[PDB]
Design a protein around this ligand. Structure first.
Ligand SMILES: [Fe+3]
Lengths: 117, 23, 104, 156, 224, 43
């Protein structure tokens, strides 16, 4: 059709079909796959806590927020030798003071971050 | 549940720049 | 003051309990609670019978500067509405049972 | 009198009412149960002390020559009464207070930890040789923390 | 409209352990009044149409008992009481009940002594219950991740006045009425003799066994 | 009030967050606890 761009869903990657018209009587079609990224609603953070057998009700509650770093249709500019991050997965504290905890035994040091309410 | 990223290379250049690629 | 904490706070204690009394109470079927060196604050919402099997505990009622000491072999009844801090300094083991009104 | 420092003790010596308080407005029978055993915080400290002692054993085994790990002793100056030291630390420009938790070597069970440490190293090596990764889900001390929590939960 | 059911035996069938005069007053007057007063408090309310067990739980109101609770709970209690006894009762139970009794009390003889003592020490008006404890709590963090299958056990519980174990989500299996009207015409103040007569001549263990099967199935349905 | 303690604290965490995230649109949010099970299920 006359539409400048048609996006074809996969019947592995989505295909964006765009009509390009160099002159008033000549035109051609450029076919481009895009990225087909799925953000996992499962971010691996069993790395945080040992998943105790019992969990008491807490006023505090952690949250996992998915963050698309760039706006819809906005350009992502790539600086040489640096990779572009598109998605950030931050943890939001919601319900608080933070301070260090140090465990020492026979000249050995191990730092910790204690975040409490 | 799905986001897309088309790759395009864009160069913004001054009007006086010498372009060695044809349209 | 002059009055002991046990008298003031109505903490019944039966130090050196005979085995007959333990079997009359059915202590062998009571649940088990144990701890190491730690500090436990608690407000009793019902009476609790505790038979200490190992170790010792020092009980500091809320706002108090003195303590009550209970050792292995003692049977303690903590009264309802008691607010206290329990202190342990070594391995401790007990058998407990919570008592509602009447009951025991 | 001089020895009367606790108002709650004084009123029990006579027949006087308790010091009144604002009603919490919440029914105690409707609150969630408590399962965090107070001793678990101490078990966690011992768990960290064993793990970092095990790591040094791996990295610098030349230091641990001719001494059984169960025969280790604390350093000269170990005060059992100063297990908690409060202080402050600077992170970049921010200054967060820092607490130091002194731990003894004689309150740790390094004989059982080493066998557990060596057992998991072997499985990690076997996984590596197969082109696979290995993850440890929990250790003996983590299991020890859950059983203390279960006893506290049952009491509640 | 709840109806006063008669006991499952003739009113003369419990003689000489429980006289006809006691049954004439206990069932014909006390139990009858509880049903009659309950029907006046339900008519025109939302308590219409529910079973008696539902009415008892609703009127209990988590401890702030509504006006219908005393009539509703007592009406349920007496119906349970009449089914707990039979003209040829006493003796010993068997089957899964005997296995559970020995598991949770040591032996049947040990259980009988503990049950009799509880019924004797119940001060004032009340009931003494053998119950199957498979309760669930309506609070947070109240579910055992790893049940041990010994947590569903038999218990002896005493209640005052009209209270029954239903209000704590227990499953009652046996009860004895320790209100003085249940025994005063036959034993006067001698409550010990009344309790001993109940456990030796009146208790219906086949009914208790039947109630245990339903309680066990109740817990099984919840676990699935 | 612009000088109120609430206003000062609200503007403070906006800067702390923006130095991490910035202008991006919140796609979808999930609790930590429900974002751990799903990872276990996939693994
Ligand atoms: Fe009655």
């Amino acid at each position: 059709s006359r539409h400048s761009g048609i996006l074809i869903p996969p019947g592995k990657n989505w295909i964006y079909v765009q009509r390009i018209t160099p002159t008033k009587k000549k035109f051609f079609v450029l076919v481009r796959p895009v990225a087909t990224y799925e953000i996992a609603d499962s971010i691996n953070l069993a790395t945080l806590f040992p998943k105790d057998l019992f969990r008491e009700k807490d006023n505090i509650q952690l949250r996992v927020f998915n963050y698309i770093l760039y706006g819809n249709g906005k350009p992502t500019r790539g600086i040489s030798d640096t990779s572009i991050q598109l998605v950030r997965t931050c943890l939001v504290l919601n319900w608080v003071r933070a301070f260090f905890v140090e465990v020492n035994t026979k000249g050995l040091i191990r730092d910790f971050i204690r975040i409490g309410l | 549940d799905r986001f897309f990223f088309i790759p395009e290379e864009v160069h913004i250049l001054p009007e006086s720049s010498a372009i060695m690629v044809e349209n | 003051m002059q009055t002991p904490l046990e008298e003031l706070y109505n903490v019944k204690v039966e130090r050196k309990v005979s085995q007959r009394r333990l079997e009359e109470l059915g202590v062998s079927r009571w649940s088990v609670w144990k701890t190491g060196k730690c500090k436990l604050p608690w407000d009793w919402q019902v009476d609790q019978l505790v038979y200490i099997e190992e170790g010792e505990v020092r009980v500091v009622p809320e706002g108090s500067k003195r303590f009550m000491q209970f050792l292995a072999g003692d049977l303690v009844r903590y009264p309802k509405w008691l607010e206290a801090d329990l202190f342990f300094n070594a391995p401790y083991s007990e058998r407990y049972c919570f008592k509602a009104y009447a009951d025991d | 009198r001089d020895g009367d420092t606790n108002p709650d003790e004084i009123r029990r010596d006579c027949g006087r009412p308790p010091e009144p308080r604002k009603d919490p407005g919440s029914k105690p029978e409707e609150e969630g149960l408590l399962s965090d055993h107070p001793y678990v915080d101490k078990l966690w400290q011992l768990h960290v002390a064993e793990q970092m002692i095990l790591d040094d054993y791996e990295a610098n085994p030349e230091k641990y020559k001719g001494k059984k790990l169960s025969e280790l002793s604390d350093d000269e100056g170990f005060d059992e009464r100063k297990e908690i030291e409060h202080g402050e630390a600077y992170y970049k420009k921010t200054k967060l207070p820092k607490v130091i938790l002194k731990t003894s070597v004689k309150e740790l069970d390094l004989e059982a930890a080493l066998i557990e440490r060596k057992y998991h190293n072997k499985l990690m090596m076997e996984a590596k040789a197969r082109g696979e990764g290995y993850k440890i889900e929990k250790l003996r001390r983590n299991i020890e923390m859950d059983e203390y929590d279960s006893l506290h939960w049952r009491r509640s | 409209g709840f109806e006063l059911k008669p006991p499952p035996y003739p009113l003369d069938a419990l003689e000489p352990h429980m006289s006809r005069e006691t049954l004439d007053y206990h069932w014909g007057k006390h139990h009858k009044t509880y049903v009659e007063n309950l029907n006046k408090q339900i008519v025109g309310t939302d308590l219409d149409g529910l079973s008696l067990e539902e009415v008892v739980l609703l009127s209990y109101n988590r401890g702030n008992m509504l006006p219908a609770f005393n009539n509703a709970a007592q009406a349920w209690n007496h119906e349970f009481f009449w089914e707990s006894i039979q003209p040829g009762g006493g003796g010993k139970p068997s089957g899964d009940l005997l296995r559970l009794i020995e598991r949770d009390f040591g032996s049947f003889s040990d259980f009988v002594e503990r049950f009799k003592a509880a019924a004797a020490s119940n001060f004032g008006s009340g009931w003494t219950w053998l119950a199957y404890k498979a309760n669930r709590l309506d609070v947070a963090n109240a579910v055992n991740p790893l049940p041990k299958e010994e947590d569903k056990k038999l218990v002896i519980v005493k209640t005052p006045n009209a209270v029954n174990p239903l209000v704590w989500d227990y499953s009652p299996l046996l009860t004895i009425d320790t209100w003085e009207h249940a025994y005063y015409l036959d034993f006067e103040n001698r409550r010990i003799e009344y309790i001993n007569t109940f456990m030796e001549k009146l208790v219906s263990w086949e009914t208790v066994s039947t109630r245990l099967e339903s309680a066990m199935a109740r817990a099984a349905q919840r676990e699935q | 009030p612009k000088n109120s303690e609430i206003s000062k604290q609200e503007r403070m965490k906006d800067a702390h967050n923006k130095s991490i995230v910035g202008k991006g649109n919140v796609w979808y949010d999930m609790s930590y606890d429900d974002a751990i099970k799903q990872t276990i299920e996939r693994r």
